Each structure stands twice: as C-alpha cells, then as structure tokens.
C-alpha cells in the first residue's frame, strides 16, 4: 500500500532538483513552525547562545499528490529512505555552529499528504550569535534571535511564512533548564532583505531573556553594603587608636576591589 | 526502530576498528539489536539544599517518525535497566542511590509518540563540603571569638582578627 504509493510517485519522471510547479508561476510558499526545546549556554563574553529546536516546514508539491481527494486511500504516507524530494534549502543566517541529530537513525520526519502537501520535521542544535547590550548589566534584558531563510532560491522561487496558528512553541521543560534567566516574551517576525545576489525571503523568531536578580543581590549588592557598613564601625573607635581605623578602611577597600574583579 | 533520545544534546556511536553494533535474527523472526552510545543529556537540577541535595537525571527514548499506530516501546519485563559493576567507582562525587524505569509517551501536534524514560537518582557526597566549607567556616568563626579574651585596651588585635576572618569568609564563599 504505502510502499506502492511511493513507488507510483517516483516511477514516473520526478526530479528532486526541480522546484515544485505553481498554478500562476508564483513562488513555492513554505510555512514554518518552530519548537524550542532548550536554550542554554548564554555566553556574554562571545555574545552568543546555544539552543536546540525542532524545525517544521510545510509546502505543496503537486507532483507528489497520489490520493488527491483520497477518501479511499491513507491521508498521508511517510517518506521512506531512498526517495529524493525537493526541499527548501533553508539555513540559519546567524548560526555559527549547527548539528543535526543522527543517533541510531537520523532524527527526521517527512510526510507526503494525498494532496501533495509535504511536512518536514527535523531536530537541530544551534549556536547563534546574539549581540548583547550591558548598559544595565546586573538588571538587563537581552533579545536573542534565530534567523531562517533560503540560500540559493530568491523571492521568485521560495517564500517563507510563519504558520498561522502558534508559529513558535516552547517545550514545557525549557524554563527549568534555563536557571540564570527568565524567558519573558517571544515574537515571530520577518527579516526579508535585499542583497547583491537578489531579494531573499527570511523569518525571524525572537526570545526575550530577563537576567535573574537573586544571584547579583546575594553575590554583589548585599556583600558590598555589608562591606561599606563595616567601614563605618571605625567612626566609633577612639580617634587615638588609628591603627584600628586604617585596618578596617583599608581591608574593606581592598576586598571591594577583589569582589569587583 | 528509528529511536532517538529526546533530551540528548550530544550523541556519539562508537566505531573503533569495527562499529560497535550487534544484530541477531532469531529463527522465529525475533531481532536483537545492541549498540554502544555515548550521550550528553540535559538534566534540570534544583539547588534549594545545594550542599546536601539529590538530583534526578533521566534518559528519554522514543521513535521520531513512527507514531503510536506503527511502533510502541515497552521496557523489558525483567531487569530493564542494568548498571555495569564499575559505575559507582567512576562516579566519585555522587552516590547513585536509586533507579526507575517509566513511560513518557506524549501527544504532540504531529501525533502521539510512544516513549520510555529511565531515571537515576544522584545523592551528592558530603565529605567534601564538610571539609572544604563547614569545618573551615566553624574554624573561622571560632577564631573571631578568641578576641573576646584580649584586653579591651588592645583593640588593634581584636580588629585584625575580626576583619581577617570576615574577609577570609568572603573569599571562601566566592
């Protein structure tokens, strides 16, 4: 059944190198859903962060329609190994490092719906660059983004659009694996840009990270007040015993330096 | 089964000389598949009792493409989880007190996927924190007291003690 349906699609002349046809010659519309699994290693020195997400792409390829109306056949067929299919050559413009997960079997899923609609799902681990602004360092908020766009195909061939309903989703155990920050807000936007090689469609998801304060309260503010307050208890020593005063003022000052370092 | 580890951040198969896999095909059609895998898993930890805490780390296992109508995972009936004898000896900082074998099947937007979950319980060794934190701090606080026995006229001595122990206290904590 399924193996036969697949065989019927690739027994004819099908070229995975050729872009799927369109009714009006328009571009291939690729809907994108994105599921963040974990956001970790938020490096402030190199201004980058790691994040593991599930990319989900969906487009229409009439050539792959087998059931059409169906209603007698299976809704969709899982694409097995050894069958090539044209896919959006999407990449992450601000990715510095990327890994696909291939443990045991590669972590991918491709479905071919009867009408020719394709669902593509893949796990990807990224290390993205995220320029940060430390004006209010201790109590700051940073905004980190994942950009997504086609590399070779221009605006006449491929166009990205965020899924209409819940384009960005978070796994439940995301905030719990992110102890240092608090993921307050997310946004889903477009970043299409015009380059020297053409106009390329582009999506951009954005998370907003609010730095946890409890640490800096205990490891910076509290201890410094406690240090400054100590420098005051020398105002209560007789003016004759200056050694005591200096020892206090000097020690607290030195310690102040250390802590800051 | 295209199984993967949902909470794996990094994974390596061992391929030294020949790849470390074993596949057996029993006469009845039963298949045995064995493979060595090195993982780096995410394990959210809770440090409320930091010095004397216990963490629970898990390895999740599920199919990626196949849904609940095609593939279903079940833990072996007898001893689903086993430990090599030299595991606790290669784990000096903690003590693997308890293990559990559970299911984590979940319903997603792409379907309902079968899922297993093994869980180890790690109890942090205390000997280190006794010697490197508690003992030395008591020893530090006790020193601040020996200034109560210096004559009230020699305040330089008192301050030097109280101040030094305080500074050191800071350092140690840092």
């Amino acid at each position, epitope marked *: 059944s399924d193996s036969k349906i697949l065989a019927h699609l690739f027994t004819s002349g099908y070229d995975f190198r050729v872009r799927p046809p369109t009714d009006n010659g328009g571009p291939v519309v690729v809907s994108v859903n994105m599921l963040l699994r974990t956001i970790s290693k938020i490096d402030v020195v190199n201004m980058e962060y790691s994040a593991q997400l599930t990319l989900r792409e969906s487009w229409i390829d009439k050539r792959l329609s087998y059931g059409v109306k169906g209603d007698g056949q299976p809704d969709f067929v899982i694409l097995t190994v050894g069958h090539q299919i044209w896919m959006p050559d999407t990449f992450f413009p601000n990715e510095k490092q990327a890994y696909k997960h291939t443990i045991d079997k590669p972590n991918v899923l491709i479905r071919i719906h009867n009408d020719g609609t394709v669902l593509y799902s893949v796990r990807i681990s990224l290390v993205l660059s995220c320029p940060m602004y430390l004006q209010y360092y201790p109590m700051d908020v940073q905004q980190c983004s994942i950009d997504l766009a086609s590399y070779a195909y221009t605006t006449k061939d491929i166009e990205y659009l965020w899924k209409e309903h*819940s384009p960005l989703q978070l796994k439940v155990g995301l905030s719990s694996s992110l102890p240092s920050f608090q993921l307050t807000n997310t946004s889903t936007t477009y970043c299409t840009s015009v380059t020297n090689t053409g106009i390329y469609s582009c999506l951009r998801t954005t998370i907003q990270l609010k730095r946890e304060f409890s640490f800096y309260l205990l490891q910076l503010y509290i201890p410094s007040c406690m240090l400054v307050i100590v420098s005051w208890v020398s105002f209560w020593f007789d003016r004759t015993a200056i050694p005591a005063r200096v020892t206090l003022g000097v020690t607290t000052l030195l310690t102040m330096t250390a802590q800051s370092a | 089964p295209d199984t993967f580890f949902p909470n794996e951040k990094q994974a390596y198969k061992h391929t030294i000389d020949k790849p470390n896999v074993l596949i057996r095909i029993h006469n009845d059609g039963t298949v045995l598949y064995s493979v060595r895998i090195s993982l780096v898993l995410s394990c959210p930890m809770y440090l409320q009792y930091y010095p004397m805490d216990v963490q629970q780390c898990s390895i999740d296992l599920a199919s990626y493409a196949y849904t*609940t*109508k095609d593939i279903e995972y079940l833990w072996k009936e007898h001893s689903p989880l086993q430990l090599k004898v030299g595991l606790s000896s290669s784990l000096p900082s903690f003590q693997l007190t308890n293990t559990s074998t559970t*299911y984590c099947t979940s*319903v*997603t*937007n792409t379907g*309902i996927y079968s899922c297993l979950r093994t869980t180890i319980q790690l109890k942090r060794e205390f000997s280190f924190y006794l010697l490197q934190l508690y003992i030395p701090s008591c020893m530090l606080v006790i020193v601040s007291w020996v200034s109560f026995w210096f004559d009230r006229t020699a305040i330089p001595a008192r301050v030097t003690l109280g101040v030094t122990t305080l500074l050191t206290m800071t350092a140690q904590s840092a």
Partner: antibody
Amino acid sequence: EVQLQQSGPELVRPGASMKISCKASGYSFTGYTMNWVKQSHGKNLEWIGLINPYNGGTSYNQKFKGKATLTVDKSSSTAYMELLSLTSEDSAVYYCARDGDYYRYGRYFDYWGQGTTLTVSS
Amino acid sequence: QAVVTQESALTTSPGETVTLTCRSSTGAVTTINFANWVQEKPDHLFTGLIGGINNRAPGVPARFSGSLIGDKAALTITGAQTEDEAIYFCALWYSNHWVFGGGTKLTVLG
C-alpha cells in the same frame, strides 16, 4: 478537588451544528489531555477523540473524523467540541474525561464530566 | 472490526471477592492494549479506576486491582462494598483509538 463542568442539554434540528463545552477547574488545566466519549442509547460507549490543551494537538477516532472537532481555550480553562452535520444518530450523551498523567499521555481515565445530553430531532 | 466483550452482569455479597473480565476479539489482551476500567454510578457518574501500564486514578480504593489473568484483562475487587455496586466498563487501546465493552452490571446483594 478537580471538576469538569459541561454545558447544559441542547435540542437542535438535523443538518445544524452545535458546540458543547467542558470547563475544568481545580487543576493546572494545560497539563492534562482531554478525551471525549459518546454514550448513545443504541450502542455502547464510543471514544471520539482527544486533545492536548498545552499543545493544541488532537487525535480523532477514524469514525468521528469530520464529525467532531476538538478545540481548547487556555484562558478560560475550557475544552470545546464541535459536532457537524448533526443527524438522528448524533442524539446521545457526550462526556469529557481527563487523562491521568501530568504533562504526558498515560492512557488512563481520571475524572469525567456530568455529561451533556444532545437531542437531534425533527 | 475489533470488539470488546464483558460479562452482561455479575453478583456478589459484601465482603466477598468478585472478578470482572474484558476480552479482545482480535486475540489476547496484551500490555499495549492499556486495559482501562471505568465505573458508572447511577445518574451518569463516571470515574476511572485502573489503566495505562499499571497506574490508577487518584483515590481509587485499594480493594480494586488489575491484572491479565489468562488472555484477557481482569478487574478484581477484593472485599466488595455496598457502594461498589455500579456498571463497570473496560476499554482497550487498539493501535490509535479506544474501544469500550458492553459493560458489566455488578450487583452487591442487599
């Protein structure tokens, strides 16, 4: 204590379509997936489908594919169920039953609603 | 297609031990059927008892217990009580959906 309060009884003519609700309270609504069960006088209990509040994800019984449409409103902690092209056969009592596991599918029933009686007659 | 079968009705006295059974038509009830047991008190009061792998609903009395006696799912009430008189439906999971039984009307004699 947890509770699943469903909408009142409804009388609708064939061809029309109505929507019954199931307001959850006493638990983190978005943590447990909801089942819908149909108890008709003519047959036994039938499993319609289920929905994951947190996920929006749904899975229907092949039988009710196109007859029922499970949705969920996180803000009001309410699970809804649409029934299209209502006919004589749709005259039944529709229950909503929670799944047992916390933020995962356990495949076992917790609490049910009092049920909603739908009468489709002409 | 696949059908679930239960005893039409059963009788037992307060204190005794009764056992309801749930049969699959496709074969033996295995663990991947996740046999569920539901109770229906008069006036349409449904509540879960057992299900899943070997987990139970919150508050389900200790006297209730599940097993796979023979090649069908069982629900054993050890020390039946007066209030235990109700209709018990068992449900099996076939691949991707639930299938209920005809239900068993357990009567605790009075």
